[PDB]
Amino acid sequence: HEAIMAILPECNGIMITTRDHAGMTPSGMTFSTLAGMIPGFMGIGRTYIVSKKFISADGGIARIVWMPKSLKDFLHDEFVRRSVEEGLGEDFIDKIADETIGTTVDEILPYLEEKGHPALTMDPI
Amino acid sequence: HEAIMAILPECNGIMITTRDHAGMTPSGMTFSTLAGMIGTPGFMGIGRTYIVSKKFISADGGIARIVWMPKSLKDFLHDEFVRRSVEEGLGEDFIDKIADETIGTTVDEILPYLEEKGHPALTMDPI
């Protein structure tokens, strides 16, 4: 798998990481530890994130609270368009934390709270 | 439940936290968040004195798996826990090889401490 999603229940959202990102993630694990493990975790294609159908019952992209920065750049223009389609705004992608904000829940929560990230007040995940 | 255990795959070990401890834990969750979930695999609600029983997760290696607990749980269990350490071949000072919130509340913060101290979970078989 190219990418792995993990639920972050404290953020009411998900994180995603990729095979090329060697860094720690807010799940407490690297892509590699996540890959070894695979229930709240799922292997996916990178392009699945910007598909119409992406975790729709959970609110789709509005649930995403962290991705590596290189995943943001890869998806950038599609992701901005989808944000606009879903009513989230062109700048939703900057509401999503990444490794420049931090790699742990402790470090990203305040950012997410400060940016008003919609996951924080959506139905529980 | 008095306490919740959670697996920390990256440390090859478990953490435990308690009903009364408000802080973030290296699972990326607080106790209430953890409680809300197990009302899940890799999480288990337990009594605190289970930790010092003879059978404490024996197939997983018992107390040797624990890499993080809050300082207040260490104080509550201290004498019992030190005695069990000695019985398990881990030394009286095992308890100080375990991280707590003075060392960090995240995997990133505790890993180098556990590595510096030679915490045995890191070299045991996979959890």
- CATH code for the domain in which residue B4 is found: 3.40.1470.10
Summary count for chain B: helices (H), strands (E)? 4, 4
Please give the structure tokens belonging to residue B56.
């404490």
Structure tokens, B17: 């936290």
- Residues of chain B contacting A39 with CB distance shorter than 8 Å: 40-41
Alpha carbon B54 to its chain's center:
16
Resolution (A): 2.2
What's the token pair of residue B33?
């968040």
Q: b/e for B34-59, b at 16 or more Cβ within 10 A? A: bbebeeeebbbebebebbbeeebbee
Write out the residue range of the structural domain in which residue A121 sits: 1-125
What are the backbone dihedrals phi and psi of residue A44, each rounded to the nearest 5 degrees, phi first?
-150, 165
Residues contacting residue B89 through CB under 8 Å, at least 6 positions apart: none
End-to-end CA distance of chain A: 23
A37 part of contact set with chain B, CB < 8 Å = yes
Contact flag B107-A28 (C-beta cutoff 8 Å): yes
Partner B contacted by A26 (CB < 8 A): yes
| DSSP character at residue B16 | E
Sheet holding B43-46, edge to edge: B43-46, B3-8, B13-18, B66-68
**In 3D, which of B64, B52, B72 has the Cα closest to residue B11?**
B64
How far apart CA B62 and CA B44 sit, in angstroms, is 14
Q: Rounded CA gap, B63 and A79, in Å? A: 46
In angstroms, rounded to a whole number, what is the distance separating the alpha carbons of residues B46 and B53? 12
Which of A28, A30, A39 comes nearest B26 by C-beta?
A28
Residues 86-105 of chain A with CB under 8 A from chain B are 103-105
Cα nearest neighbour of B127 on chain A: A37
CB atoms within 10 A of CB A11: 25
Q: Which positions 44-83 of B are in contact with A (Cβ < 8 Å)?
A: none
Amino acid at A25: T
Beta bridge partners of A18: A3
Question: How many structural domains is chain B composed of?
Answer: 1
Q: Does the beta-carbon distance from A33 to B10 stay under 8 Å?
A: yes
Which is it for strands B13-18 and B66-68: parallel, antiparallel or unpaired?
parallel
Is B27's CB within 8 Å of A28's CB?
Answer: yes
Question: Which residue intervals of B11-106 are DSSP H helices?
Answer: 31-38, 71-87, 94-97
Any CB–CB contact under 8 A between A123 and chain B? no
B105/A24 Cβ within 8 A? no
